[PDB]
Subunit: 207 residues, 6 copies
């Protein structure tokens, strides 16, 4: 990553074994459950494009997913090139990043450091991270196991467990249905609650 040092200057630091291992095990244990996205974002804090590629490439499984992510990345890089075309460079001068440069495939670590620490800085790490998260959200939605239409409170299911399933599914797929899909008893209670009830009030009512 790029991080600030005691002297107050942005400098490159090696990605730590703890971060690498953390990402790899997150993916191993959670697959593409939605909460893996914020974790990724936090673990790639300050990441260069090289670091983002390191994190993605250290994943051993889910290679269908990783190829889909390559597709998204290439699409976003093509659009970047459409918006920001690039014009031999002047001796010793910063060149303009193209899509494959932001994705870290045609740019060196040193060039990425130069862009990210330029004044004004070109945050190629954050732009690339945005593309990656776009692709990852596509994957989260794709691997969502169940439709919100199929989450219905069981006849003996505590209302809390049902709401947990409901908003877990809703998060993967990225509230009147909540009442509609409740079971008869709770549905009666919630119908009686009236309009404008908070989720807190509903969960207390069916407790």
């Amino acid at each position: 990553p790029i991080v600030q040092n005691l002297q107050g200057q942005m400098v490159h630091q090696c990605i730590s074994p703890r971060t690498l291992n953390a990402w790899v095990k997150v993916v191993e244990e959670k697959a593409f459950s939605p909460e893996v996205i914020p974790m990724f974002s936090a673990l790639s804090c300050g990441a260069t494009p090289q670091d983002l590629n390191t994190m993605l490439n250290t994943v051993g499984g889910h290679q269908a997913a990783m190829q889909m992510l390559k597709e998204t990345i290439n699409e976003e890089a093509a659009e970047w090139d459409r918006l920001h075309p690039v014009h031999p460079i002047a001796p010793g001068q910063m060149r303009e990043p193209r899509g494959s440069d932001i994705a870290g495939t045609t740019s060196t670590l040193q060039e990425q450091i130069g862009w990210m620490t330029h004044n004004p800085p070109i945050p190629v790490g954050e732009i690339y991270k945005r593309w990656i998260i776009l692709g990852l959200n596509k994957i989260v939605r794709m691997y969502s196991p169940t439709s919100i239409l199929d989450i219905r409170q069981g006849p003996k299911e505590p209302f809390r467990d049902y709401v947990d399933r409901f908003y877990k599914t809703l998060r993967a797929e990225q509230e009147t249905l909540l009442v509609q899909n409740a079971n008869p008893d709770c549905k009666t209670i919630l119908k009686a609650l009236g309009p404008g009830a908070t989720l807190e009030e509903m969960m207390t009512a069916c407790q």
Copy 2:
């Protein structure tokens, strides 16, 4: 988080994998037992709003709870806007944070750093943390399993185990009842103790 460096200046540091993992596993293992609140508070020491959202969003389960927390957060943000309305910004000048800015949803990391390190500083991280803890306390109370009225010393239950259950329940729900709910033998001893007895004296008496 924002933390002080050797030069004595407040600077942003990436949230560490150890902190993220610690929060996630705390929630996995303890759910919303009351002691999870102080842990959260300590793990979010120095947190920006972005960091607080990272911690909350990396939780994969308890999505009913997390939605309730969103409700509380939005309520507090609305009140903040009621008290501190906001007035294009002057070029290069700090803008005033609104509720969604303090919650980290309409503000950037850089803006949050600027507020938190301004002189005088606007501690958006601490204000947001306060809202979050308010919501979390609502959740702790909601998920409290048992009423203090139903904690009664068993006929063979050591007094210590009963007091542990009593104050654990009291903490979740957020002392004469202690004697009232004791079993006959201990209740006789404690009645004989007289008024003004410390908990120490009561636990020794029924030991």
Copy 3:
């Protein structure tokens, strides 16, 4: 905690996840065995009152104990107020800490930092830690399982195992009895040893 930095100035640092986890697991595994006291003291090295409350409040069990500790703390705070009464503050000036300020319940983190780093410093963290350890010693003594009078060497118990139990119990409860409570054979050997024998000499004699 408050710790010294490279510049040689006392500054506040966030309590680390390793320390929090260490305390919580210490309590989980050892309950109030006496050795938990020194561990606490070491883990709270440099602690502000806020940090001490964090450590105590992250304990989920033993809530009878924690309430007793609150009682001790309040007693010590009352005595502090008896000895050091407090007299609106002068603009921008340090106010005098009262008992609840030292216990971290009516004082802010910033005020605690100011006291602890003042010249001369008011070590509210160490004063509070003293009160906490007083209460904790009360708890260790209370939860001591056995009286030293009931520790007696078994007819086939190695003398070493008996001495281990004897001084473990003595430590919880906070040497001629050692001979008295030894078994007949070892008791004969130790009686023959004569007066003034070191524990080493006694353990070798009955080896």
Copy 4:
């Protein structure tokens, strides 16, 4: 490794136990699955040739592989010597690295530091790392268990699991075949999709 310090100067730091252990366990658990290559690259961030030899030599198993890697390394060193022949050195002056110097077998740590921190720097660590990764890719390909021709969707295999196997195998071996090797039902769906379908569209179609 060589890393930047607060003063802004490149200095040598000892390889950490966490990095060593991480590499050793990566190899123990994953053998030469392709994702071990990026992990290696990240764990050897900033590595001197000495550090690279340390990482390779701490591997206890797979000694056939490690010998093959020695062969590749020696080949690349021979080519380096072919391109950059070396000409007693001038007193106190930097000598020119030869192949065995870049591989860390005839050069000292101090010489490697001098090359890597020279202005202009001679990045012997990165050149050597390139040779090592070339050999390692040869090994990944060699130990690839299955030909892409033998990855065919099972009659009841979810399309996702089949694509995962397909691109895992393709990665080890280093898309119309994807349709060709799909099972009859999915193959019909994908044939109907028409040309130009993204992998996302194909996986949704056969979901």
Copy 5:
């Protein structure tokens, strides 16, 4: 401990949770096997007397041992007082440490820091550590399970396993006997070896 900082000045640092846990688990797993002594010495690198007492006091078991250690410590403190008697102190001046001061029982942390960082420094941490290791060696010898006279090579015991037991026992208790206690076959081989044989030569001979 006391350690050097970037400014080059000796300053006090809190004992780390990793060190505390390491010592406690070392004792839990190895009891007083001889190798626990060097580990202690290394874990108490730079330790103040307070730190040494922390390490000793966090041990929950082996309280016979810990009392014996108190006896040794008090003996050494008495001798220190015999050699270095102490003479109200001059205002603001360093006082002379007595035995109980070096053992950390009548001296404050601040006084210990002052002694250890004085010019010339009075290394109370190292003196105390010496006393502690003296007592600990007494304990290692006491808890040694077996006499070297009773270590004899079994009729089918590999010579290596026998030598391992022999020097393990010798280390606890703190070479012609090696041949004498070997079994008949190996004893014949070693007798034939002649005088002046290295342990290497003996182990190869009986391999």
Copy 6:
């Protein structure tokens, strides 16, 4: 160890609990398999003689081995004395290290720091480490379980597994035999390969 600080000066740092534990567990798990040597070398990066003795002495088992290592060390120290005899020292001046000084048995930590940070520096840590590794290689060879002559490919053993055993054994003991010891089928294939075949080509041929 001795390591460079931010100010750019070589200073002593305490050996870390992670390094100590790493060495101890390496030895516990791998005994004297050859790969333990590079690990040792890396874990003792920057080590003083005191640190090397700490690492060796914290090993609880393999005391035959450790005594043999003492023998090697003493031999090398005797040779050092033969080559570099030593001549009361001049007040305040650096004395010349003798063999037992380099082995850390007659020299203090402070003297070792002085030698290792002198200009020119006397690298007693590296000289001693060399002696230690010489002894350790003797031990690796001694504890090698099998002769290379006894490694022969099984009639159903994959060629890869056989080469792994072959070069593992060769490494412990410190290529035409490879063909000679292969099984009949693979031996025919490799004989047909002709002269000059790389190990890669041989392993592919018998795959």
